[PDB]
């Protein structure tokens, strides 16, 4: 099983994507964990066909204390020798040399297409190698094969078969940093702000920048604007002004262009609208801001389970197998064969040079023009003539979540576009049964984006104590749907009253729960919405606190997560912050499993790395508490390091959501909007709505590949309801990298990894 | 000691922490190694960029100058240090960073109650027995109230305290905050300001802590 | 080494003294601990003859949960039928059956002189019963020497031999809480309390408790009353009504006679107070009540000692060494051999005889003829019409402790009967700086044996800050000596003063530190005076604690002690109690440590046993606090047991002295007040006193055998000074006995026994 005896290299190619490093961290450590020699090559393809001094092997420490390094510190450069089969060919001598049957390559798209030329000539150059003498027709058999297992790590997303690459999640939080800059200001001025982002044959972070900015107009190089959008726009920036709102944003690549050739610059943008409009503008570019700044949480968790992955695709790798790309489709592992993902890019490419051009976009991906599309549904109100008798009320329960507000923006003017009335309730069942329901329009969910917490109020109180009061008021407001955006107290709420529906007629309803909350412990999804802010705001409080020790002392922290009962918070902080424990409900720990992590912390505090991270859940162990561990640590590191503690509380709480929670929110705001018409549809019948199947109350669910509704009567079985979480958590395989990456010697049998699968066309 | 040149400085500026190792020590007990090693250096003059204990270090060197001649070699300190608390200047190099690092986590613990909820958070600072820390935070953020050593309060004036911050939770501000240095008093802990705000906001606000640990140290330096 | 192959017969046989259990215990458990089967014996020497089912083997659970029980398990009879050879022979016969040459017998002199002839006439039995044909001359040759270990279980304390015996402690408290209900009221009426102890041919227990007391008089019959005493006593009673004492104490032995052989009754007494004073007389008798009750904390401790080092005798005792009694002269243990005990016994009964009568009292030994002159001298004032110009003051320094007002009673008579002029210094060193000097007489320390803590103020300050104001005082009011009663910065402070007499000629005054702590933390003692009270407060308190399960649940508790960084008081309260552990500072100990105790309590709570009970040092640990240990046992004996959790704070400071506290206090203070007449005569010269020599300033030791006087300087070398204890401690070896009788396999080769000395004459 263990790939002892042969070797890996793993480079890094291309523009600087952060979280290269913790992908580079991964596959040494796995690599090395496994038994295979790791051999660090710097600079990429560079460094590769030098050799030499540019390529050497890795030990555990080589990659220590790089996670929350942005760029990389193996280093990259842009090489035309690989290019050219001269530089290929010295490339291929420097692996044979190494012995490096197995290579790891991190990067763009133009670095994974290298990759790809490199293997389909990796026999005919060691064939022409062994023919002018440079190695010997034995040691040539041997190394016949080279194994290539690609990382995407590049801003771009320009690779095609693949759908989220290391380095897009922290670019966008560079973009939306200084959007926020402008936004969370008290607005004063009537101004433009116009945005310059780096994509130049790629639109995407302009893209998603724009939906979770909630940016007014967006060029984009995928989908030109039509001729004569100078007036559109400069017409959609005059009724924006008349509604009111004093700030405009425009998000333009810059590979943006008209339908022709010709390019548009942000320049031309911004004196047309000086001109226009008379607007103060002003041209933000951020240039090589972009690449900068430390690896987002996402990046960090998901650069480290795709370096993983990579490893052992590589160690279970026959002759016969292609290469390919380990990427992640939805939550999924998923490895594409490398030639496959060139094509389709190559194809993207053509398509985009006027072959196919309108038919380019729908080539980039489903979630490229699913992400458009619903951005200019959300930009603009455009005038709903259709008209339904359906109304829906839409509640927040539980906790505040980051992202309940970009929910329930898309909610509102979805529902309004497919012509429902829709109605919001403050403080969720509360004030369903204290009848605080209010009609709201398109614009009174304004800038609700970016906002954390909740606009509506929040209160986790169960409708079972005022469920005459709850459909008292449904029967008022004739609600015939209910959309609750919260956490477990959300998806139990509406399990209360799909149960009362056999009382009550009038619950009969249809019901959707999207889940957000911090601890992500609803069941039918992976990733409740907040949970990636509270994450980001997890690791950027214990990046704080570990580089609080300068580099002489020797300290421990003994850093305390909130999420209840539900582990997920402290282990995925745990990998983005390479702690050495993540102490935990869901892997029960005595004192023998606390003295052989204590004594596995004083001898790594031996070695040079002088700073140890252990995380611990608020509700992980009834009695070995923070202080109980700070005493432990402290007492048996006595004379090896100092031990202190910080209780992060409400500080992974109230921040601004991440770019992705606000993406995320918004999509699955639209969905729940989308099926929650669907089944309205499906369900009215004899004049009025009848919902009493259980399909007809789901939690929207983004379920390993795919967005999935699962009914809440199912879930109950799946629902440990006593700890307010699932029973069968899918993240529990990632403690196994966690422990892997702090040198824990852990049979990890029962990590899976995904399997190969064929592009979606 | 280690002779340094133009560039082993290089980039140094937003690096923080300390790239010379730091220690406490004061050179009183190893006062014969220290004259030994100027001896063996030449050192003509000593900088000593630190908190309390550097000042208080060439203290100990300049009345150690009538025992030794090697000490009579110029001094100057530069204080640096989070507490702000070293004699003989109003800004230690370093304060500005645990402010601006202290209020950002206040403005986000009181940013987390939202709507309705009204929560008072009892944050605790550092900054030893020197409350300048606390109390440049708490004006910072909009604190109802900074407890420090150097004005020191008794049970009186927590109820005076708690009751305002009471009155002022029924009104339509939601979100108190107060502020407690590490060193203002022996016994009224954080844990103790937790149990009298929330017993006796009973029923019109919640109370919440948040000691603020190393979160106001490590942070790269301000501009 | 191990007694393996080898069996050890235990028998108690006489009065049931309380404190036998505890020697069972320890005799059982320490012989099956180095490999040798125990037999007990029930019923004594009745079931040595009859056997059979009166004898019977041992296991570790067979003495559990006994040392807190009064009387004795195994019980005791009186047999006839081991006084002739018919019984005796049978006796013998029942041992060989059971191959039990080893016997461990803990009784009275009555048991160990039927013990001695035993063993005296084993060979002859032996012959005598291979020729009768019970046993084989094979089966004989074995087993052909018999080994005595005796124990003295006795409230008489009649073996002349031995100082000190089981149950003489207990007994005492016994009588003293008795004698306490009567002192320690609110006094009305003018009445007289006669008190009749139940020896009647050993006067000890009358005597140490008249001297506890403070009895107006007492009759024992080792020194009748002269002819005429009659009025002597009533004329006594007189005085002390015309002083305005309300009460007086008459003890009287039941053994009380004259100088003939006619007994004095204690109705007579009370008839004679009754005509000639008139007082409310009344008779108390104990009678049983003297054997019953709880064995005191020293009782079990010795109980525990004795018996084991009675198995360790045992063992190390070839066929030529003779039968040996295991005792404590003084804080020492001891063996004697038997037939020299029980032939001194012999004499003092025939001299009782009216042989060598007004000489058997100095045969009953030194102890004994010493504590009757102290108790009479320190009764009535006498007058001393010598006189000096000594003057003296008394310091009580530190904390209080329990017994400092005897000491300070004792000191004052001793120094008055010598012609000192005594004062008083309240407050100690504060005191003594600030001049609050006050003279004191003889009635004015009236009372003071039983009150607890300090009539003289105490305070912890050193006399260096205020050195002047204290040499001040001393040459104001002419302090010629120096006595402090108090713990460790009575000693400390002296020793403040010492070092200054080169500064200030005044401070070279005779000094003498009286140890008086809880903590028993003072350098040159081995018991601080008030630490025995400390240790019996708190083994009552923990058997309190465990006894609140009451056998049903099973339940561990953590209870904490005080002594500051002196594990003393934790280690013998938990000999005193059974504790599983007893963490101390100078025994330290780590997480591994605690795993193995813990499981240690887990495997042993499974067994028959259902109380835990660990003790901790309050300052034993910097992080494993009693709050850790809760948390650590409590989680690790899930589903096993619970755990509860009981700080001792000032439970164990504020009660009355124990009668060995005040008799200690009492004698100490006398000796104390000894050597400062006599070393202030030796250093008087020149017409003035001039104490500069180290030997000047010392503390009253009682030290291993008898009474001592260190230097305050020599004993600075082994002082603690920052732990505020001595640096080697004589009671570190009770560790491995605590740990032995709970199960812990400690290779105690660092235990030394008490060696073979002969009887002093
Ligand atoms: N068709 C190709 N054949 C061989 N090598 C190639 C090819 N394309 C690119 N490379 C090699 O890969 C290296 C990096 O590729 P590239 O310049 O396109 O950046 P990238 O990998 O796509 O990253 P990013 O887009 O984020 O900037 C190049 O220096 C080049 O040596
Ligand atoms: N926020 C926006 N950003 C960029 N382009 C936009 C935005 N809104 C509208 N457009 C573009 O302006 C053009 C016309 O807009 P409009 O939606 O009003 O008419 P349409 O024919 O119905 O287009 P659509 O296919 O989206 O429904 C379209 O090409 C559209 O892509
Ligand atoms: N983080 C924030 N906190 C508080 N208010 C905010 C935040 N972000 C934006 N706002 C407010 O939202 C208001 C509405 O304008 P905004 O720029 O945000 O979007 P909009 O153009 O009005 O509509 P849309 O939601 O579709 O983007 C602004 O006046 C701004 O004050
Ligand atoms: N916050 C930081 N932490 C760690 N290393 C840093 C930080 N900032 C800069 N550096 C490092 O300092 C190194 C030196 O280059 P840098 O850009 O910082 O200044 P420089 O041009 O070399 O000289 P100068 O100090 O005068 O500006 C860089 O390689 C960079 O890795
Ligand atoms: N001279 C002796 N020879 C043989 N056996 C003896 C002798 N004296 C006593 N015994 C035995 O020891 C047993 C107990 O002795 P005894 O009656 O004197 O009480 P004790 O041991 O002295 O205890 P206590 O004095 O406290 O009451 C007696 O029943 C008797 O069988
Ligand atoms: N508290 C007492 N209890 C019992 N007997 C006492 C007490 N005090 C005095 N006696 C006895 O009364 C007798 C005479 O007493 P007293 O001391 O006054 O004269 P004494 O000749 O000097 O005797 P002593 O040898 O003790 O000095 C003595 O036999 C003594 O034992
Ligand atoms: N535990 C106690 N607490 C408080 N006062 C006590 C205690 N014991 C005795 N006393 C007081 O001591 C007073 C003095 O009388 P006490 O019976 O104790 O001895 P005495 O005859 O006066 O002299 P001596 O000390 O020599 O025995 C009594 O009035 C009594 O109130
Ligand atoms: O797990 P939930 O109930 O869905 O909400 C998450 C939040 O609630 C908490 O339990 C804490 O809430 P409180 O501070 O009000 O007590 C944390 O887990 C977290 O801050
Ligand atoms: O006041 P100083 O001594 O100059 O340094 C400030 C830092 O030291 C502290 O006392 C805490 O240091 P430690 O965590 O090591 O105990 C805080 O006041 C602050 O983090
Ligand atoms: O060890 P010491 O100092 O001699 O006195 C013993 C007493 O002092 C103590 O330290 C406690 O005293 P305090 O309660 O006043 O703090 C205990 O060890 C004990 O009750
Ligand atoms: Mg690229
Ligand atoms: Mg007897």
Known sequence: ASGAGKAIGVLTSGGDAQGMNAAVRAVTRMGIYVGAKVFLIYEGYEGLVEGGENIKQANWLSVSNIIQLGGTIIGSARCKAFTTREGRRAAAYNLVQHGITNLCVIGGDGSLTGANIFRSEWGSLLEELVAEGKISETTARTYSHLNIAGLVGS???????????????????????????????????????????????????????????????????????????????????????????????????????????????????????????????????????????????????????????????????????????????????????????????????????????????????????????????????????????????????????????????????????????????????????????????????????????????????????????????????????????????????????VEARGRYEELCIVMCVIPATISNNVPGTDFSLGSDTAVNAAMESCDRIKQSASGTKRRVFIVETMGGYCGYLATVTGIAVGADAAYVFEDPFNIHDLKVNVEHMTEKMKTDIQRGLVLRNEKCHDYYTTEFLYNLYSSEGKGVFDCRTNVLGHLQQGGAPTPFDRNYGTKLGVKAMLWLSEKLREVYRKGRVFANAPDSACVIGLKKKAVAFSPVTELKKDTDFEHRMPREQWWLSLRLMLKMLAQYRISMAAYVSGELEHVTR
């Open 155 to 497: 801003i771009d997303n320009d690779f095609c078969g693949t759908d989220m690459t290391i380095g897009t999640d922290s670019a966008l939080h560079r973009i939306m940093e200084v959007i926020d800059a402008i936004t969370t200001t008290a607005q004063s001025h009537q101004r433009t702000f116009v945005l310059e982002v780096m994509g130049r044959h790629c639109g995407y972070l302009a893209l998603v920048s724009a939906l979770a900015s909630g940016a007014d107009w967006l060029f984009i190089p995928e989908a030109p604007p039509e001729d004569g959008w100078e007036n559109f726009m400069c017409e959609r920036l005059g009724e924006t002004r008349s509604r009111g709102s004093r700030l405009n944003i425009i998000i333009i690549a810059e590979g943006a262009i008209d339908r022709n050739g010709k390019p548009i610059s942000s320049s031309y943008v911004k004196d047309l609208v000086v001109q226009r409009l008379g607007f103060d503008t002003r041209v933000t570019v951020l240039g090589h801001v972009q690449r900068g700044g430390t690896p987002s949480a996402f990046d960090r968790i998901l650069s480290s389970k795709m370096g993983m992955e990579a490893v052992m695709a590589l160690l279970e790798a026959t002759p016969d197998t292609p290469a390919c790309v380990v990427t992640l489709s939805g939550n999924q592992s998923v490895r594409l064969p490398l030639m496959e993902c060139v094509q389709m890019t190559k194809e993207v490419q053509k398509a985009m040079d006027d072959k196919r051009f309108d038919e380019a976009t729908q080539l980039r991906g489903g979630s490229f023009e699913n992400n458009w599309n619903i951005y200019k549904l959300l930009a603009h109100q455009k005038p709903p003539k259709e008209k339904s008798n359906f109304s829906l009320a839409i509640l927040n329960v539980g906790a505040p979540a980051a992202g309940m507000n970009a929910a329930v923006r898309s909610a509102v003017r979805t529902g309004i576009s497919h012509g429902h009335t829709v109605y919001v309730v403050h403080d969720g069942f509360e004030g369903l049964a204290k009848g605080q329901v209010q009609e709201v329009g398109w614009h009174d969910v304004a800038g609700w984006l970016g906002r954390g917490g909740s606009m509506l109020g929040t209160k986790r109180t169960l409708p079972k104590g005022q469920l005459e009061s709850i459909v008292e008021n449904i029967r008022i407001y004739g609600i015939h749907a209910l959309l609750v955006v919260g956490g477990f107290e959300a998806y139990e709420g509406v399990l209360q009253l």
